[PDB]
Amino acid sequence: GAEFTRLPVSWTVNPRDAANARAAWKTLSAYHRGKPKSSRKLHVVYVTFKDRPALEGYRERYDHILKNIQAYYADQMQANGFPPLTFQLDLDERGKLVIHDAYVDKPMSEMSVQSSGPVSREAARKVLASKGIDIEKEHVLVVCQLPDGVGPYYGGGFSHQGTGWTCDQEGLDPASFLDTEMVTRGKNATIYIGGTAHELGHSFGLPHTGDGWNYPDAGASLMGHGNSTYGDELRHEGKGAYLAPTDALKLASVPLFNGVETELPADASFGRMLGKYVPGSFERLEAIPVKDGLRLKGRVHLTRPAYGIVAHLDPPGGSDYDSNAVGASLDEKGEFDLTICRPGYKGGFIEMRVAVLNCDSTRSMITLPVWMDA
Amino acid sequence: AEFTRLPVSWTVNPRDAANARAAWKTLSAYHRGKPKSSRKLHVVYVTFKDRPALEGYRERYDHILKNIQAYYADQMQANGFPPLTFQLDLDERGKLVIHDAYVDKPMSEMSVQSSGPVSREAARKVLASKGIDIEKEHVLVVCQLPDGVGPYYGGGFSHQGTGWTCDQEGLDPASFLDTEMMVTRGKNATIYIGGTAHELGHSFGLPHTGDGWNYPDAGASLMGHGNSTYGDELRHEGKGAYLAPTDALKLASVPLFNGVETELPADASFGRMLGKYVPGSFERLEAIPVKDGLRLKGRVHLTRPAYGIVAHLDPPGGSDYDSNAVGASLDEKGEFDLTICRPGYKGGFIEMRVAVLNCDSTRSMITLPVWMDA
Amino acid sequence: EGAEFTRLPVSWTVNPRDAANARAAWKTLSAYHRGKPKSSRKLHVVYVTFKDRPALEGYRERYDHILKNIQAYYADQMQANGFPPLTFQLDLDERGKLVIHDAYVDKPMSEMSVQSSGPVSREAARKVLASKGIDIEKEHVLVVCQLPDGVGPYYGGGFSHQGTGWTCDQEGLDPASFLDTEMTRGKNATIYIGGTAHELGHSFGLPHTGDGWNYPDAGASLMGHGNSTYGDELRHEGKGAYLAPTDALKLASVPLFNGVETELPADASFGRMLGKYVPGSFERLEAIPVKDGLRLKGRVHLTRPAYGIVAHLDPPGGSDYDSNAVGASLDEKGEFDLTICRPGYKGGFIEMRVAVLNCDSTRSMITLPVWMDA
Amino acid sequence: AEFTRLPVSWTVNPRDAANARAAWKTLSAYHRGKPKSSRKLHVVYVTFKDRPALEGYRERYDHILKNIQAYYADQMQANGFPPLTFQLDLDERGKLVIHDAYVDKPMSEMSVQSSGPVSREAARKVLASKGIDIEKEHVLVVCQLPDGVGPYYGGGFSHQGTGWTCDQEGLDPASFLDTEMMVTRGKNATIYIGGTAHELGHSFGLPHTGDGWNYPDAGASLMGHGNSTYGDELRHEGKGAYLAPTDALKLASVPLFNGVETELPADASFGRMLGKYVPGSFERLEAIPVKDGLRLKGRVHLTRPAYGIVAHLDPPGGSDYDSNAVGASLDEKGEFDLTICRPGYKGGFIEMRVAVLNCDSTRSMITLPVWMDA
Ligand SMILES: [Ca+2]
Ligand SMILES: [Ca+2]
Ligand SMILES: [Ca+2]
Ligand SMILES: [Ca+2]
Ligand code: NA
Ligand code: NA
Ligand code: NA
Ligand code: NA
Ligand code: NA
Ligand code: NA
Ligand code: NA
Ligand code: NA
Ligand code: NA
Ligand code: NA
Ligand code: NA
Ligand code: NA
Ligand SMILES: [Zn+2]
Ligand SMILES: [Zn+2]
Ligand SMILES: [Zn+2]
Ligand SMILES: [Zn+2]
């Protein structure tokens, strides 16, 4: 992996999470029996503008960037107990990343942070459509040749479609992760390449999941603030970013990751959190208090095959960045049993989200208002 | 007997009477030292340009209002509370005071959509002339309008509400005994006076509560379809309308009923169901399945003094008319334990609403999606 | 022709402005369809029997008549509106007769309810259709149930690219009965076959559109209360059911109707009304009062190709059954100009919905609160 | 001068002053015959187990509260209104009355999530000791807590509100002049006292209103980011903070400011923006595009007396901090005419909020999606 500065795995999964991943993968693998295989890829578009020509080495640099994130997701999913699942890239005969070029005949003065997303997305749609790729049904990364004050840094999508936006900078490459010269030059690469890994997670349907007591020496959760520590373990003794078991549970049912072209149900709907959702119900639901935590057990009514369940604790304020999450697998009857803790929590009230993970890639969510103390 | 006082045609289950006594003890402790209320249910009679008042309306609605007043008093007592009910504004002869309001529009200039707002505005002006603010009181607005033009509606909460009805020739609770045909004349009075008693319940903040397995021989729940059986026990062979124990629990914290002028909290807000609501939370919540039922137990976190909790089971479709409810009291720590059943239910999915009753007249509600079978 | 399935006549004449709108909308849609794949979609039919509920006699021939009657109706009504005779295609065998998939549910009627018959029959339809390679989650389907009233489902729900309609069979139900004045009854056949045509409109994404001043002698709008007058002509002074021009405009972008397999955008989302929606905006928007009406003109900002616009006037109460609608086409710049009236309206307040019709089958909707008088 | 009174460092545009004069004439007629208000903004100082009161807090917060009081008065007057501001509870010496409350919890048992509710509960009990109901008054809760634990928040509406802030050693408006470092001491005092003035605006029901093209040399709008420039004149660092004309219009109907005890209507409800709202409707509404702007004119249907109207332009993202607003008065028929601009805007889509200001202190709001260019 050294050619694209492959990141190491700087954490060890808890045995309960590894057992959850193996059971979820067994349930998903049975569901995948007999279904068509997926040929989906994460496509990359580079968008230039009238006074904004392409930056040097962008084809080689983004071959390194995408392959670094690709290997990262692969290595992190494996560290969680899944196979090394990750998105595939469109590669040329030499194994280098295919990059679609798009140009927008507008000067930067006619652009804004509000319009750079839609304008670059339309440009990406046109060039991708010319090669038979529908941006409305695929996962795409849109790279903009724009500066921070105008260009977009955003990610949004779900299991069957998503778009991520980023901006290129001169010499941006994962090889800079080791450079401690000059705010440092590794931290700069950490911010933007880690941000892209984070925004791509959103395009796969992942919300925010912050750090939790069960992983104090694992680095920062990628979907929390791990976008600021991605690859920082290669300099100055840092802890890096790890993919939370709950996020690995969610990605396991994404066709782009599991290589199986499952079909979405007609009632799959957007919700307040990222992803697509369907109605669910409980035959049994129990929230039992413990010291600085909660034991959540019950029985999901299986209207459809489902493989797992994810509980989030979310203090009021600060969006979902300060949340922590715990995963669990569902047996053949839909029963689950997990404990989620917040040691030393003094906020009293806290929001609990409960998300059932369906094999058809949708989710079912309920929200419960909980009081927690010692 | 002068206003044809209705009998009490049902017996409360012992557990519900014990809940009412425990709830009344909690409310009485909360009421210690608070100012007493002088609130009344005010009555306005609205005429229109070509629509003069019907004969005997002052005597007839003196009978109607005292009949509904005595019913609520008798039903609250049958539930285990004191005979709580709304007070009336009476003149020196002990007769109901009725404010006359006039709308300078012919009946042809009216509609079912505008009759409500227009008559309410006319009621505001006449009530303001006597120093009574319609925006902070409970009022019954009687319109001299025929069916299909006039309003029959009720809406409000614990500290304000308005009920709308239309007068008809000879409408009097004495007609409950009349078996002559006009639908007989007793059934007609049952429909209209029962509708007023039902819609007045809405003005107090009550949603719909249909009939339940725990009361098969009590008549029809007033807030279900008991508006069509109110007072029908006085003829033929009918079971009348009874005030559901869960509705009695909610009304006990209404100042108009308990005679105590408590203050509403600043965050009291309207919701999907009638009434005003504030946030709540649970320290423990358990929904345990039983045959054709569910046991709901847990511990409410008491951010404020609270006296009871009401669970509703509501099959999809048909609004909340087909719901059934079970009440329970809260101890000093917020603990509750109830069981709610739906015998023979084959619908599978059923909605469960859980409403904590706060002493400050607000409620805290959650909704859970539940699967139920045998 | 069409006498074999008792083809209905066209008992109304479109207003010239609406036919001109339809032609402009079809020109815009036709340009958008250039180069897009052709559609092979069909309206599939499933017949579900139960343990003590065997199939009724002649159901294969009767529903060949029923489905072909509704098919010819939509074709004739779309043509009467100024479009080509657009309609759904059916799956026919070598003899040209309707294909009906047989499904059996091994459950007695005592194991059914009005809440579960819908979902249970859908699951049975899913299993049998999958056996023939038909995914119920990506097609329009009619599920015919061998269940009686009060237990069986009568429902329609869906959008442009998927939908399901539910109905129940009754002995001898056939469109030939439209002429029968005995008692079977003609009104009986009108109600059930008209309900199916109406509910199929829901499955295509249509909400309710009641009758309007601009069509007083056209019969009852199918999506209003026309389900109760469908085919009531050919029986004495009946005026039938007509397809509102606004409903014809909406169906013209449905692949099942226009035969073009357009792709839905990723952000297509469900809303408060039936159909799928995307964000939109206006460059200019003017609501000018007229006597008992409103002039609505402006300029839609074209984020995507759009062909038409539909305005709804909806008095409060009574759901959207009492609404009236007016259509208008969009020029190449997004300009529109329409007038919508409600003569003699006395409600004062009225809700106005404005829905831009996109060529990709989605819509964009805003709601405005309007006061209207003479 | 004793409390370092701020100057007026901006001049209102003539059209806005005429709007204020017209709005105040309309409000004054509505106030005729209504009872006078004796409301005051009460101040509570909350200490904790290991957090004793800081030195001189009574004199320092007498200076802080009178400074904000004089600020609102001078700014309301500079806007064209009378010098409206909140009244304070003063002792015999004319010094601010500060209620002392104690929380029996060490700082280690506190958090940013609980500091608000816990200190609010402590303030409720002590204010109740003097007959002041926190649920029906405006209160400022000053906490003896450090940053990261203590609360800085404001929330409320016209008839009730609560502001939260934290005390710091030596915090006094006299520090506005100090240019020594701590990052200077005037900037520190500006942030904390400006935050309090800003959060108190939220407690009065004001959302965010950022800066606009019509006031480029007036400083920063208080309800935008003016909390960070409050008092910047007194040390020649910048132009300070000014009260936007749209905010002055909203505050003019607040009893705490106008001294008239008007009654809130029963249907006053919270919404997505701060304040309480009632339904409204338009007889005419026109949004006419101009170069880099929009002309908004029409006729509000007056269901109740209304005095003004406020338009917000809000680009997507960044919350409402980057919005700009324009005010306009309503004549006796509800007619209004304003123009709101965003020069050089390149984002295309922009959100427009339209808020009718009712004399009973509530508002009526609609939201329109607008496309804007040159
Ligand atoms: Ca949070
Ligand atoms: Ca129901
Ligand atoms: Ca309606
Ligand atoms: Ca914004
Ligand atoms: Na390691
Ligand atoms: Na640059
Ligand atoms: Na570093
Ligand atoms: Na970034
Ligand atoms: Na009459
Ligand atoms: Na009877
Ligand atoms: Na059991
Ligand atoms: Na019949
Ligand atoms: Na007939
Ligand atoms: Na959706
Ligand atoms: Na919508
Ligand atoms: Na601050
Ligand atoms: Zn993020
Ligand atoms: Zn009702
Ligand atoms: Zn319908
Ligand atoms: Zn703020």
Author numbering:
A (entry chain B): 19 to 200, 208 to 399
B (entry chain A), D (entry chain D): 20 to 201, 208 to 399
C (entry chain C): 18 to 200, 209 to 399
What do the authors of the reporting publication say about this deposited model?
The uncharacterized protein AMUC_1438 is encoded by a gene that was previously shown to be upregulated when the bacterium is grown on mucin. Here, we provide structural and functional support for the assignment of AMUC_1438 as a unique O-glycopeptidase with mucin-degrading capacity. Structural, kinetic, and mutagenic analyses point to a metzincin metalloprotease catalytic motif but with an active site that specifically recognizes a GalNAc residue α-linked to serine or threonine (i.e., the Tn-antigen). The enzyme catalyzes hydrolysis of the bond immediately N-terminal to the glycosylated residue.
The core fold of the protein comprises a five-stranded β-sheet with a single α-helix packed on one face and region of multiple α-helices on the other face of the β-sheet. Pressed against this α-helical region is a β-sandwich domain comprising opposing four-stranded and three-stranded antiparallel β-sheets. Bound to the β-sandwich domain was a metal ion that was modeled as a calcium atom. A central feature of this catalytically active O-glycopeptidase fold is an ∼30 Å long helix that contains the HEXXH portion of the zinc-binding motif where the glutamate is the catalytic residue. The third histidine residue outside the canonical metallopeptidase motif, H233, completes the zinc-binding motif and is found on a loop structurally adjacent to the α-helix supporting the rest of the catalytic machinery. Underlying this is the “met-turn,” which places a methionine side chain directly beneath the zinc-binding site. Together, these features identify the catalytic center as having a metzincin motif. Overall, this fold is the same as that described for OgpA, the most structurally similar protein to ALT (RMSD of 2.1 Å, amino acid sequence identity of 19% over 292 aligned residues) and whose structure was described in detail previously. However, two tyrosine residues in ALT, Y171 and Y217, were structurally conserved with a phenylalanine and a tryptophan in OgpA, both of which are structurally implicated in glycan recognition in the G′ subsites of OgpA.
